Amino acid sequence: SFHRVDQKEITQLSHLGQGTRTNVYEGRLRELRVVLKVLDPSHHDIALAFYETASLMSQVSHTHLAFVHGVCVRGPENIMVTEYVEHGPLDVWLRRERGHVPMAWKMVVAQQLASALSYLENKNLVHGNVCGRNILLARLGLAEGTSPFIKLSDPGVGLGALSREERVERIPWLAPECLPLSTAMDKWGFGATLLEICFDGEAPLQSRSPSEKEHFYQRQHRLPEPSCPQLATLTSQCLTYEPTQRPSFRTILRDLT
Amino acid sequence: SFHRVDQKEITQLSHLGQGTRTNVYEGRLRELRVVLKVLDPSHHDIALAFYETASLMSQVSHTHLAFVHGVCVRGPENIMVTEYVEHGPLDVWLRRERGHVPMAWKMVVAQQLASALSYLENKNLVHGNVCGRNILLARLGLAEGTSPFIKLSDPGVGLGALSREERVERIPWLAPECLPSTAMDKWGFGATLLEICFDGEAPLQSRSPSEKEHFYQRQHRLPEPSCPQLATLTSQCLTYEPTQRPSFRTILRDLTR
Ligand SMILES: CNC(=O)c1nnc(NC(=O)C2CC2)cc1Nc1cccc(-c2ncccn2)c1OC
Ligand SMILES: CNC(=O)c1nnc(NC(=O)C2CC2)cc1Nc1cccc(-c2ncccn2)c1OC
């Protein structure tokens, strides 16, 4: 379970984006600043998948995971009330500052992403949506002697409710076993996100057509090596088609530090 | 003197604000994150008050004073290359977080500002523009987190070069004797101490130039702070007799107890 929010406590403001089956808005919680994830009109299947995500996030506590205030369930409306994170999604930032993000900064982001993912591994919980967009910058770490500070977002509508078409869109982040749930899928996610971070918010296959994406996974191909050997080995280990072959986050965090 | 920065070394980024006769931009220095204070096309005396400010800031070193990198000369425009601090101006932050800033937080900021201002007093060096806006937050310190870490900015185009209209615009922070010495920063400190107490809202801010000037001409005194721990300190500071204002050595001593 998750905390219930009455429609009278939440105010909608600026549209920020569009998630899988959702529309992201800025909002107020009665007045604290929040983000409202408004689920589109849906079957009970999708509403339940949205609840599992709120629940996963509601029963966790880590310094590098966004907080969930609860869910507001009305007539045809489901709104996840979540933490507003100052500088927004990392992928957008990495594109804005393309060619000007040092290796040291990216490395911190990776340690923080893996610290957050080691905690869900030990509690045998699956995030299932690791990508640049779901990494939020609480602190930019642009000034000397200041490091970036991340906050991994809620995974949105759970993978179990998405269609093949929607799963194909999640490539290169989607684990190949997930194309047709284990914690090993977040190892593929962490891996494809390392690549996205190295290539300054430009993930491999991102421009490719759904068929070209689907074919790459069907033909069992592998993603490019990054432009920094500081992560080249770690990525090859994570981005293996064999789930059992992927390193544990305990191992990853060791391989980083 | 000060360092000469070529325009090849700098990169102008997003605009942050406007000062007296300047436009403030975020930027890069070849690679550090910097703040570029671009002076408007100016006459040799204005540019000299700008060069004098660069010089003051260049030839001083203090933990709680922002760093000046050098000066660039791009056609009619002069660029003061300064330090980028993580959270920017303090007034902006106090207004944003009004009614959520503990007295302790305000007292750490006060001492830190008195330290910077004592350093310059032992050096017999005036600032001339001590106001909330010229208080930069390197560490936010809410909550706890460790406590805040401010940096007093450069004062921009020196007072001496400004007009009556510009000097009036600096009320309530402008010392009354400066409307028609190191004593002026004691008023500036006092006026800022009110600004910090009233959560970034200074007295006379929203008033007309004639109302502001009239308040000073009629020798009218500013409000008492809602912070009782500062009532006497600011009363001693915000006096119309420069010689009746305490030294920063005294303010610091008093602040500890
Ligand atoms: C848990 N809190 C959050 O997720 C969240 N928090 N803060 C911000 N702040 C901001 O943006 C700041 C203004 C810059 C944005 C956030 N989410 C967000 C914004 C825009 C698009 C998406 C999206 N979601 C799924 C698919 C695609 N995009 C999205 O969710 C990740
Ligand atoms: C010496 N370095 C600086 O002054 C300075 N350094 N860092 C930040 N960081 C940021 O903001 C980053 C976004 C967090 C802001 C800074 N200055 C600043 C920002 C915006 C407006 C002004 C202005 N100056 C005079 C009058 C009115 N406004 C201004 O100068 C004080």
Walk me through what this model shows.
The structure is a homodimer of 257-residue chains. By secondary structure, chain A is an alpha+beta fold. Chain A has 2 domains: 1-84, no CATH class; 85-257, no CATH class. The first copy, chain A, is 35% helix and 18% strand. Chain A has a 5-stranded antiparallel β-sheet, with helices on one face. Chain A starts with 9 loop residues before the first strand and ends with a helix. Residues 16-17, 19, 24, 35, 66, 82-85, 87-89, 133-134, 136, 153-154, 156 of chain A line the site of one ligand VZJ. Chain A: Keywords: ATP-binding, Kinase, Nucleotide-binding, Phosphoprotein, Repeat, SH2 domain, Transferase, Tyrosine-protein kinase. Chain A: One of its GO terms (molecular function) is ATP binding. Chain A: Belongs to the protein kinase superfamily. Tyr protein kinase family. JAK subfamily.
Q: What's the oligomerization state? A: homodimer
Molecular shape of chain A: globular
- How many individual helices of chain A? 8
Order of helices and strands of chain A: EEEHEEHHEEHHHHH
Q: What is the number of strand segments of chain A?
A: 7
CA radius of gyration of chain A is: 18 Å
Helical percentage of chain A: 25-40%
Largest two-chain interface: A-B, 8 and 8 residues
What's the number of domains of chain A? 2
Give me the side-by-side strand order of the main sheet of chain A.
1-2-3-5-4
Bound molecules: ligand VZJ
Structural class of chain A: alpha+beta
Instruction: Please give the largest β-sheet of chain A.
Output: 5 strands, antiparallel
**What is the CA–CA distance across the termini of chain A?**
36 Å
